[PDB]
C-alpha cells in the first residue's frame, strides 16, 4: 500500500559551496553532465553520476546521500541501499521513475 512520490535533489559544488537542493517536479532535463543526483525511492536512493562530474562533488553528494538518510525522514530503514547509476546507462528500474524519458539525450 505504499504510495511513493520520488524526491530528485541535485548535489553541486560549481556554485562555490556544496548544497543538495531537492529539484520541484523534477524531469528528466534537470540532470546535468556535471553534477550528481539523488533520487529518493524511499526503498533505495539511486546515486546518478554526470558524464563529468568531479571526485570533489561526487565525495560530497556522498556525504549529503549519507547525512540525508539520517536527518529526512527519520524512523527510515537503516539499510536503505545507495545504487550508482551512471549517465547513459541507467536501468529501467531508475528511469521508470520520471514521467518521460528520451533515451537519446545527451
Do not use: M
Not at 517536479?25 to 553532465?33: A, M, T
Not at 560530497?60 to 549517465?87: C, F, M, N
Request: net charge negative; aromatic share 14%; with cysteine.
Amino acid at each position: 500500500n505504499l504510495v511513493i512520490t520520488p524526491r530528485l535533489f541535485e548535489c553541486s559544488n560549481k556554485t562555490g559551496r556544496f548544497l543538495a537542493t531537492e529539484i520541484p517536479d523534477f524531469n528528466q532535463d534537470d540532470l546535468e553532465e556535471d553534477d550528481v543526483f539523488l533520487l529518493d525511492v524511499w526503498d533505495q536512493v539511486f546515486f546518478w553520476i554526470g558524464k563529468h562530474a568531479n571526485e570533489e562533488e561526487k565525495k560530497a553528494a556522498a556525504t549529503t546521500a549519507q547525512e540525508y538518510l539520517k536527518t529526512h525522514p527519520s524512523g527510515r530503514d537503516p539499510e536503505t541501499p545507495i545504487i550508482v547509476v551512471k549517465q547513459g546507462h541507467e536501468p529501467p528500474t531508475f528511469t521508470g521513475w520520471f514521467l518521460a524519458w528520451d533515451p537519446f539525450k545527451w
